[PDB]
Design an enzyme around this catalytic site. Structure first.
Site, PDB file in Angstrom:
ATOM      1  CG  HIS A  45     -51.193 -69.491  89.247  1.00  0.00           C
ATOM      2  ND1 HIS A  45     -51.128 -69.854  87.938  1.00  0.00           N
ATOM      3  CD2 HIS A  45     -49.861 -69.376  89.688  1.00  0.00           C
ATOM      4  CE1 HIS A  45     -49.846 -69.978  87.571  1.00  0.00           C
ATOM      5  NE2 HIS A  45     -49.058 -69.768  88.652  1.00  0.00           N
TER       6      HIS A  45
ATOM      7  CG  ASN B 203     -47.374 -68.570  84.587  1.00  0.00           C
ATOM      8  OD1 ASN B 203     -47.462 -68.411  83.406  1.00  0.00           O
ATOM      9  ND2 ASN B 203     -46.959 -69.731  85.153  1.00  0.00           N
TER      10      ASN B 203
HETATM   11  C1  FDA Z   1     -44.295 -71.712  95.077  1.00  0.00           C
HETATM   12  C2  FDA Z   1     -44.460 -71.506  93.514  1.00  0.00           C
HETATM   13  C3  FDA Z   1     -45.102 -70.354  93.056  1.00  0.00           C
HETATM   14  C4  FDA Z   1     -44.856 -69.882  91.761  1.00  0.00           C
HETATM   15  C5  FDA Z   1     -44.440 -70.792  90.808  1.00  0.00           C
HETATM   16  C6  FDA Z   1     -43.998 -72.072  91.165  1.00  0.00           C
HETATM   17  C7  FDA Z   1     -44.113 -72.443  92.521  1.00  0.00           C
HETATM   18  C8  FDA Z   1     -43.711 -73.875  92.860  1.00  0.00           C
HETATM   19  N1  FDA Z   1     -44.119 -70.347  89.582  1.00  0.00           N
HETATM   20  C9  FDA Z   1     -44.732 -69.271  89.086  1.00  0.00           C
HETATM   21  C10 FDA Z   1     -45.376 -68.395  89.959  1.00  0.00           C
HETATM   22  N2  FDA Z   1     -46.059 -67.358  89.442  1.00  0.00           N
HETATM   23  C11 FDA Z   1     -45.660 -66.832  88.242  1.00  0.00           C
HETATM   24  O1  FDA Z   1     -46.166 -65.734  87.926  1.00  0.00           O
HETATM   25  N3  FDA Z   1     -44.944 -67.612  87.361  1.00  0.00           N
HETATM   26  C12 FDA Z   1     -44.383 -68.829  87.657  1.00  0.00           C
HETATM   27  O2  FDA Z   1     -43.482 -69.462  87.032  1.00  0.00           O
HETATM   28  N4  FDA Z   1     -45.543 -68.744  91.278  1.00  0.00           N
HETATM   29  C13 FDA Z   1     -46.298 -67.849  92.181  1.00  0.00           C
HETATM   30  C14 FDA Z   1     -45.425 -66.640  92.566  1.00  0.00           C
HETATM   31  O3  FDA Z   1     -44.158 -66.974  93.195  1.00  0.00           O
HETATM   32  C15 FDA Z   1     -46.303 -65.663  93.337  1.00  0.00           C
HETATM   33  O4  FDA Z   1     -47.392 -65.164  92.589  1.00  0.00           O
HETATM   34  C16 FDA Z   1     -45.541 -64.440  93.741  1.00  0.00           C
HETATM   35  O5  FDA Z   1     -44.418 -64.809  94.506  1.00  0.00           O
HETATM   36  C17 FDA Z   1     -46.460 -63.573  94.611  1.00  0.00           C
HETATM   37  O6  FDA Z   1     -45.686 -62.440  95.030  1.00  0.00           O
HETATM   38  P1  FDA Z   1     -46.145 -61.543  96.359  1.00  0.00           P
HETATM   39  O7  FDA Z   1     -47.626 -61.007  96.277  1.00  0.00           O
HETATM   40  O8  FDA Z   1     -44.938 -60.667  96.568  1.00  0.00           O
HETATM   41  O9  FDA Z   1     -46.268 -62.556  97.577  1.00  0.00           O
HETATM   42  P2  FDA Z   1     -45.345 -63.750  98.108  1.00  0.00           P
HETATM   43  O10 FDA Z   1     -46.316 -64.687  98.684  1.00  0.00           O
HETATM   44  O11 FDA Z   1     -44.217 -64.231  97.229  1.00  0.00           O
HETATM   45  O12 FDA Z   1     -44.616 -63.001  99.292  1.00  0.00           O
HETATM   46  C18 FDA Z   1     -45.423 -62.619 100.373  1.00  0.00           C
HETATM   47  C19 FDA Z   1     -44.613 -62.508 101.669  1.00  0.00           C
HETATM   48  O13 FDA Z   1     -45.235 -61.804 102.701  1.00  0.00           O
HETATM   49  C20 FDA Z   1     -45.079 -62.692 103.871  1.00  0.00           C
HETATM   50  N5  FDA Z   1     -46.042 -62.559 104.887  1.00  0.00           N
HETATM   51  C21 FDA Z   1     -47.151 -63.158 104.877  1.00  0.00           C
HETATM   52  N6  FDA Z   1     -47.822 -62.732 105.946  1.00  0.00           N
HETATM   53  C22 FDA Z   1     -47.097 -61.779 106.577  1.00  0.00           C
HETATM   54  C23 FDA Z   1     -47.344 -61.065 107.722  1.00  0.00           C
HETATM   55  N7  FDA Z   1     -48.483 -61.209 108.402  1.00  0.00           N
HETATM   56  N8  FDA Z   1     -46.360 -60.244 108.124  1.00  0.00           N
HETATM   57  C24 FDA Z   1     -45.147 -60.083 107.452  1.00  0.00           C
HETATM   58  N9  FDA Z   1     -44.926 -60.794 106.279  1.00  0.00           N
HETATM   59  C25 FDA Z   1     -45.896 -61.658 105.876  1.00  0.00           C
HETATM   60  C26 FDA Z   1     -44.131 -63.808 103.538  1.00  0.00           C
HETATM   61  O14 FDA Z   1     -43.260 -64.402 104.456  1.00  0.00           O
HETATM   62  C27 FDA Z   1     -43.644 -63.514 102.157  1.00  0.00           C
HETATM   63  O15 FDA Z   1     -42.264 -63.400 101.955  1.00  0.00           O
HETATM   64  O1  G3F Z   2     -47.052 -76.368  90.197  1.00  0.00           O
HETATM   65  C1  G3F Z   2     -45.980 -75.793  89.463  1.00  0.00           C
HETATM   66  C2  G3F Z   2     -46.572 -74.661  88.663  1.00  0.00           C
HETATM   67  O2  G3F Z   2     -46.968 -73.779  89.744  1.00  0.00           O
HETATM   68  C3  G3F Z   2     -47.416 -72.473  89.301  1.00  0.00           C
HETATM   69  O3  G3F Z   2     -47.454 -71.551  90.420  1.00  0.00           O
HETATM   70  C4  G3F Z   2     -46.514 -71.874  88.213  1.00  0.00           C
HETATM   71  O4  G3F Z   2     -47.029 -70.622  87.777  1.00  0.00           O
HETATM   72  C5  G3F Z   2     -46.163 -72.766  87.045  1.00  0.00           C
HETATM   73  F1  G3F Z   2     -45.104 -72.229  86.368  1.00  0.00           F
HETATM   74  C6  G3F Z   2     -45.619 -74.082  87.595  1.00  0.00           C
HETATM   75  O5  G3F Z   2     -45.339 -74.890  86.434  1.00  0.00           O
END
Ligand code: FDA
Ligand code: G3F
Ligand code: FDA
Ligand code: FDA
Ligand code: G3F
Lengths: 576, 576, 90, 90
Positions: free
Chosen positions: B506, B551
């Site tokens: 986060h 979150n």
């Molecule tokens: C892993 C995880 C994370 C979340 C929760 C649980 C767990 C185990 N649950 C959770 C989350 N947040 C919530 O708001 N509520 C919940 O229940 N988690 C975090 C959440 O999943 C993230 O905040 C969210 O995806 C962030 O979205 P984003 O800003 O779109 O970024 P991502 O990291 O998902 O995707 C980024 C993306 O870009 C890539 N990447 C990285 N570097 C590059 C470069 N240099 N070139 C091209 N692409 C790049 C990745 O491969 C990726 O797909």
């Molecule tokens: O570590 C798991 C936790 O990770 C966090 O990224 C999530 O936002 C929560 F929903 C979740 O329970």
């Protein structure tokens, strides 16, 4: 989805895809059902380890494996938790918790047995090791003629090897591989031969190997398509196949009952030819659900009429494991061709070799890699390059060492990943035993409990046989201790141990092959056809009737190719 | 893949997907690049937990998560292994091993910090919890008009909730969910409200929830297509984005440098508009690799001229965790409407209740479910039905309890899943604290060490601020101990603990938003535009500049929605 | 030699461990990063718990220990008393 | 002198321990010295080791010894899980 195909295939693992390759190719109207779903990316049924990200983090891929191994039979737990708070609900007995299997004897189980339900089955995560069986491990395909039997196996394995893109050269340029391979070849001079593990894989760069899978065998795209306009094939994921319907005569299958997991609806599919390749556990489950063999705890007072050898003579391999940390002497032998002077990091420090010299112990490509690493990374105390690939070493099963061996780095690690010792120094050891087929060793299915797909619950009644199997398993253990020692001492946390029965996932003999149903205590003949049944074939390691230590898949494929030949000879494709 | 596009988006996560939905829908020619590859099945970027297999086997999904969390900065390991064989090579120092980061101080790290490189980003595995921030956690979008600020946030949130398909009733028919929530609200006697965690998800059956993901926001299919013949979108997986090319005046981006991981080739890609949604770590990495902020170890008294607040004021939440075993008292109450006679498993045994009796503490449908379970499974000593859904409870952050809470079962298990205690008894507790932005808390990138993709190596310099953040963290832990005890005592093996810093993923404030680059120490304005640049926008949790416990993803999405409004107001889409 | 230990041989491991005092404990470098934010947290791996700053952890006999009781180590020893053959012997 | 938690699930009658001990070549570099700054709990100079098992015959024999225990113990039975073949702390 139509209601009538020429051939239906239950399972999209590499054995179901062997049948799809051969039959979609010969111009049949083919349907294939998998209870699992498409996930591996745009290449359907492809190896999950072929992403750039896993090739750069090999250590992570253990999680993908564990994510898709669903235990087959979990017995009831009897661990005593007596530090619960007094307010917390506390059992009075060790009741059936967590979907565990009340029918399962904990002391006669294959606890490590597990199944994968994804398109491409277990070939989406497998190690790709594809050795042939030698005669002693191998079912007969021709009797009273060894040369002709040899002949038959050599043609089938060669084709299978072709489908899998099996090869033995992908690691020829690895320093760790050659170091370990070399030592062993020398220590066992005149006693054993070593080679690179035959691997279904193709190297694309010095840091990228493209591992084979069911996708490599058959690409699982719907046909026709531009590429195969004259072909007919459909894959149907998220469909449980629950029964094949026998006529009363027990001479044909009438239809395949399916359950669509998305919509919930159940359907009957018609084929001329029915191919079951759902895995050694799930073929058997499906046949027992269809009235073959016997449902429920075995009753020898009342043996089954139909296919009485089904889920008897089951075999699983014993597996021993350790890791070693490379010996100082071996590390030093890496740089035996170098004249080293001064101290690393100090002004006088010097590493040189004479290319091509007569006294050299290593080829030049080796000494160039070592010299450059040693000179350019004087902060690093080892002579092995950072991205050097892992070893892939085996000495194959023989009469004097009747176990298979794999030495290197397998992606299926078994404990927390340790970080305090350099990964370059770590070598894995997995030796696999052959298990004698015995009638008392059974895979049966409950007539009361069901699994998560509302099918009869699998239950094992298994012990490794007390005689030659057990003696060999212990000799195998000692052999790993003796052999691994040539390379280095054990890594703490990965000390020599037997793995949980069945973790190795080489179960066979659950629907076994042989010449004569009665005389050879079996279920299918050498065309893989269920005896009595004109149009029911089983593929997979469940067919293999022998005691084998080597990895089974290529042998299964080999049997499935023979089985496709019988089908092409006996069923005619529908005209377009 | 063309020379030129209207919009290029780096990252196919849900935030990049927010930009794609808005801008493709508005008729722009959109390219999106992701360093990772397609691997959720045919629905590109979809939640990996949406397979029937994972919903029948929810305990296995922890492995899918672990398999794609690649640690951000691993310090050099200093564990002593002194039980190596004397023959094994043994370290004379704690040298850099196994790709550890020598810049990293082990004691000022967010060791739990991790990244996911797959199409759809972390949204392929997340818990789908999407709470709104109340004012106290929420950055201002309008200064000096709390009414307009609110109505702006209400409007952006309502939109983000439909994109995500957020809802608050998918778990309303769970016995466990209701047991837990009712007891909490009873026990808190008014001071706090308990509700369902708002979840980005749609229930499809009593046993399946279609979790939301990037794919729900934007299906990521190439366009035009039959379903959108007038739209323009290409996704390019396996493309590492390395640099944005600034003009010298820092008023515009000219191109984006990319490296094609399959071909190995590099290209510069042109577009009118550039959008970085690579994640909170990687947006900063890409920016720093492009001449923004400061490469190398921070130097005070050399400060960067361009975005000097980039990578400073970083925030990461404190996370406390425990599980509990449901109280006898609660288990008894589930069955409080029942008349129970005889002993389970005897012909005499019966469980009945009066439907509609005014004294019943529970609705008929509950009592029916309890009765059937208890009568159909008299071997089971619990009144809770076998596939009763997990709780999904929260009391949302408030000023006198400034942490977010989630109570239920999270897929992301933290130790070995125990089998001795029935899962129906087990309830998870995760409380998330809010961390003051401070300048000293930094994400920076090494000028010598590089990562797996040859990009400057991320290094953290972070401690939880002393003062409020740390006092609240500990009050938070105590609050979890206090609240959880209302339901049951702790589950041995899951006692109350702080999780490794950053395990909660986060991270915020790495490229933070504000009104005024100087006065607010920030990097992007409320349009998510980088100050001074006409055509560069950043999206993601890195934008969030406040101390928050909830979150962050829904907030990040709402900001992206605001950013896209700016885009449609300042760039014309090209002729089709 | 007490009746109680002869009837509970399994317990006597504790008597042994009770009187083996490590000779040289090096400085610990294990990283505990799940301390509460309020808790005092080291900035370095300083000399804790009477450990020995002079001791190289990688060149130690960590298991070396001494017994300080009348009769020394012979109050707990295994009593195995083999002779050396010439090759082992001064 | 057991080395791990006492296991109860297997009958003690079946359990046999194996301890093999190696001979270590005397080498001048292998030292027990005493600090001129740090003291132990009796205010005496702190013992410090500078020790490695010698790289040659000592180390070769130690590993051969390990293999010998694995070979020999196997004649009696398989290893007990939790007490797998290992070198003990130096
Ligand atoms: C892993 C995880 C994370 C979340 C929760 C649980 C767990 C185990 N649950 C959770 C989350 N947040 C919530 O708001 N509520 C919940 O229940 N988690 C975090 C959440 O999943 C993230 O905040 C969210 O995806 C962030 O979205 P984003 O800003 O779109 O970024 P991502 O990291 O998902 O995707 C980024 C993306 O870009 C890539 N990447 C990285 N570097 C590059 C470069 N240099 N070139 C091209 N692409 C790049 C990745 O491969 C990726 O797909
Ligand atoms: O570590 C798991 C936790 O990770 C966090 O990224 C999530 O936002 C929560 F929903 C979740 O329970
Ligand atoms: C998991 C594993 C497996 C192997 C190795 C490593 C690990 C971690 N390494 C490997 C193996 N074998 C080799 O010879 N060399 C090695 O390097 N492993 C085993 C190998 O992976 C299997 O032997 C092979 O796939 C067997 O192929 P198959 O007979 O085609 O069976 P699969 O299990 O792959 O696919 C079956 C399939 O059908 C489904 N299914 C099951 N029941 C049904 C029903 N009732 N309806 C529809 N579909 C059903 C599955 O979902 C699956 O896809
Ligand atoms: C602890 C241990 C020891 C042995 C075995 C098992 C275990 C758990 N088994 C055993 C041994 N040796 C055998 O040959 N066969 C085996 O079956 N073990 C070792 C054996 O126990 C020793 O080798 C033996 O006692 C050595 O005898 P020692 O040379 O008399 O030395 P001790 O350590 O017994 O007694 C010394 C002694 O003097 C004291 N002390 C130390 N410093 C001072 C100072 N500065 N002032 C006064 N007194 C001092 C002690 O307190 C102690 O009593
Ligand atoms: O336990 C992992 C092992 O599983 C087996 O199924 C494979 O055949 C081996 F290659 C692999 O090393």
């Amino acid at each position: 989805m139509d209601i009538k195909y020429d051939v239906v295939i239950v399972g999209s693992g590499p054995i179901g895809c062997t049948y799809a390759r051969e039959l979609v190719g010969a111009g049949y109207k083919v349907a294939m059902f998998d209870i699992g779903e498409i996930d591996s990316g745009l290449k359907i049924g492809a190896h999950k380890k072929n992403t750039v990200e896993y090739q750069k983090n090999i250590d992570k891929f253990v999680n993908v494996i564990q994510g898709q191994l669903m235990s087959v039979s979990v017995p009831v737990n009897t661990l005593v938790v007596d530090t619960l708070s007094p307010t917390s609900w506390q059992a009075s007995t060790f009741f059936v918790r967590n979907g565990s299997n009340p029918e399962q004897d904990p002391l006669r189980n294959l606890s490590g047995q597990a199944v994968t339900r994804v398109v491409g089955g277990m070939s989406t995560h497998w190690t790709c090791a594809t050795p042939r069986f030698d005669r002693e491990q191998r079912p007969l395909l021709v009797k009273d003629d060894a040369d002709a039997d040899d002949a038959e196996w050599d043609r089938l394995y060669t084709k299978a090897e072709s489908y899998f893109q099996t090869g033995t050269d992908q690691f020829k340029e690895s320093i760790r591989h050659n170091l370990v391979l070399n030592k062993l070849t020398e220590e066992y001079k005149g006693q054993r031969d070593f080679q690179q593990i035959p691997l279904a894989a193709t190297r694309r760069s010095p840091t990228f190997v493209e591992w084979s899978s069911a996708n490599t065998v058959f690409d699982l795209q719907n046909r026709p398509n531009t590429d195969a306009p004259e072909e007919r094939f459909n894959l149907f994921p998220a469909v449980a196949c629950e029964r094949v319907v026998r006529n009363a005569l027990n001479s044909e299958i009438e239809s395949l009952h399916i359950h669509d997991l998305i919509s919930g609806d159940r359907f009957e599919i018609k084929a001329d030819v029915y191919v079951l390749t759902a895995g050694a556990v799930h073929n058997t489950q499906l046949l027992v659900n269809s009235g073959f063999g016997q449902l429920g705890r075995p009753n020898p007072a009342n043996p089954p009429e139909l296919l009485p050898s089904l889920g008897s003579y089951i075999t699983e391999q014993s597996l021993v494991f350790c890791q070693t940390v490379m010996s100082t002497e071996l590390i030093d032998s890496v740089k035996s061709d170098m004249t080293i002077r001064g101290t690393p990091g100090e002004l006088t420090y010097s590493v040189t070799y004479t290319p091509g010299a007569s006294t050299n112990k290593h080829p030049d490509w080796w000494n160039e890699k070592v010299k450059n690493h040693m000179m350019q990374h004087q902060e690093d105390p080892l002579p092995i390059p950072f991205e050097d690939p892992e070893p892939q070493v085996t000495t194959l099963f023989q009469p004097s060492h009747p176990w298979h061996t794999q030495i290197g780095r397998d992606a299926f690690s078994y404990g927390a990943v340790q970080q305090s010792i350099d990964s370059r120094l770590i070598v894995d050891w997995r030796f696999f035993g052959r298990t004698e087929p015995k009638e008392e060793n059974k895979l049966w299915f409950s007539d009361k409990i069901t699994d998560a797909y509302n099918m009869p619950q699998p239950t094992f009644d298994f012990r490794f046989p007390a005689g030659r199997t057990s003696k060999e398993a212990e000799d195998m253990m000692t052999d790993m201790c003796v052999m691994s020692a040539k390379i280095g001492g054990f890594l703490p946390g990965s000390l020599p141990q037997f793995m949980e029965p069945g973790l190795c996932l080489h179960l066979g003999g659950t629907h076994r092959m042989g010449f004569d149903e009665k005389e050879d205590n079996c279920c299918v003949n050498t065309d893989s056809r269920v005896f009595g049944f004109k149009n029911l074939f089983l593929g997979g390691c469940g067919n293999i009737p022998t005691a084998y230590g080597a990895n089974p898949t290529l042998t299964a494929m080999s049997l499935a190719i023979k089985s496709c030949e019988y089908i092409k000879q006996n069923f005619t494709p529908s005209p377009f």
